[PDB]
Amino acid sequence: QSGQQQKTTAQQLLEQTAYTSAYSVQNRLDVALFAARDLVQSVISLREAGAPDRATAEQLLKNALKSHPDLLSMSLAWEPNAFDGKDQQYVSQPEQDPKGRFVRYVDRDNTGKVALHNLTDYETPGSGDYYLLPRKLQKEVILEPYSYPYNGVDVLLTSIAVPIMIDGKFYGSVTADFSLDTLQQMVNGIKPYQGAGYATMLSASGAYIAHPDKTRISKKLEGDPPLMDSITAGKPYTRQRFNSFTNAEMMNAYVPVTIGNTGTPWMLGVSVPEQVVMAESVRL
């Protein structure tokens, strides 16, 4: 084999590892996507049956989180009068939204018990983007990392939001949420080539989601136009070069992570020395 044939064979093997690594992340993320889609369908059916009960929708929301231990939280939020048409009945009741909106989320307490809460920032620009973005865009959305308090501490999280669309109109939205600690666990555990390489993940905006350097989490990618352009376009990207700083021939292969119908894929990378991939091409 010529030097270009050997490069291609290692590059093909690496690209296959990056592809199956990206799919493993997609499978874990799909737990949130499917939970949110399934709850949306369930509450559309509940509403279609007429005179829907908030307590039943709350139970469906609690059950959805209980079924998925890896999820941080889930939320269910409706437009004014869009669930039961009865918001005004709740204004004077304790511990309701000030205008009686049906706006709830669930998390777990320190015993693992699912707990129900009111959403309070769902129309606040910034913190409320988990609701404001699917309302504006009227499609599935994956949010850039943001923090919110759970059990007295700030947790850095992402949300996959699925709008409640009926006849092409927006009635509300559901999220299923992951902590970034959970996402780092998933990526840091890939351990490509039995730990001889490492995996990284970036958001659609180029923020680090997972990286061996935990000081980078949620910071933006800098000084890599080809990679950033690939993330923006949702295209795979492979590169190989001799790193004169580390004195190793290094390979990098990036594969988009598809998230439902958001159209805004994240990006999984595998970084590994060429020698490691060549040795695996032999062990074949």
Task: List the one residue from 17, 26, 42, 73 that touches ligand CHT (CB under 6 A).
Answer: 73
Q: Considering the rule CB under 6 A, would residue 266 count as an interface residue with ligand CHT?
A: no
| Cβ atoms of residues 174 and 159 within 8 Å | no
Place of tokens 């709740």: 90
Tell me the per-residue interface mask from 87 to 126 with ligand CHT, x by CB under 6 A, - otherwise: ------------------x---------------------
The C-alpha atoms of residue 206 and residue 163 are separated, in whole angstroms, by 24
Q: Which is closer to ligand CHT, CB of 17 or CB of 73?
A: 73
Residues 10-69 touching ligand CHT, rule: CB under 6 A, are: none
Select 26 or 175, whichever has its Cβ closest to ligand CHT.
Answer: 175
Count of chain residues binding ligand CHT (CB under 6 A) = 8
CB of 60 to ligand CHT, least distance (A): 15
DSSP for 228-275? HHHHHHT--EEEEEEETTTTEEEEEEEEEE--TT-S--EEEEEEEEHH
CA 49 to chain centre: 32
Instruction: Please report how close the Cβ of residue 124 comes to ligand CHT at its closest, in angstroms.
Output: 10
Helices (H), the chain: 3-48, 54-66, 129-137, 180-188, 225-233, 274-283
Query: Quick one: which of 42, 75, 184, 230 contacts ligand CHT (CB under 6 A)?
Result: 75
Q: Give me the least distance between CB of 182 and ligand CHT, in Å please.
A: 14
DSSP 25-59: HHHHHHHHHHHHHHHHHHHHHHHHTSS--HHHHHH
Whole-number minimum distance, CB 1 to ligand CHT, in Å?
A: 52
152-191 footprint of ligand CHT as x/- string (CB under 6 A): -------x---------------x-x--------------
**Of 102 and 105, which has the nearer Cβ to ligand CHT?**
105
CA dist list (Å): 111 to 33, 61, 65, 106, 283: 25, 19, 14, 14, 47
CB of 176 to ligand CHT, least distance (A): 8
CB neighbour list of residue 50: distance below 8 Å, 6 or more residues apart: none
Return d(Cα 16, Cα 108) in angstroms, integer. 38
- The residue among 14 and 77 lying less far from ligand CHT, judged by its C-beta, is 77
CB of 91 to ligand CHT, least distance (A): 22
Q: What gap in Å lies between CA 66 and CA 109, rounded to an integer?
A: 12
Torsion angles phi and psi, residue 114, rounded to 5? -70, 135
- 207: DSSP letter: B
Q: Which of 23, 34, 148, 193 binds ligand CHT (CB under 6 A)?
A: 148
Binding-site ranges for ligand CHT (CB under 6 A): 73, 75, 105, 130, 148, 159, 175, 177
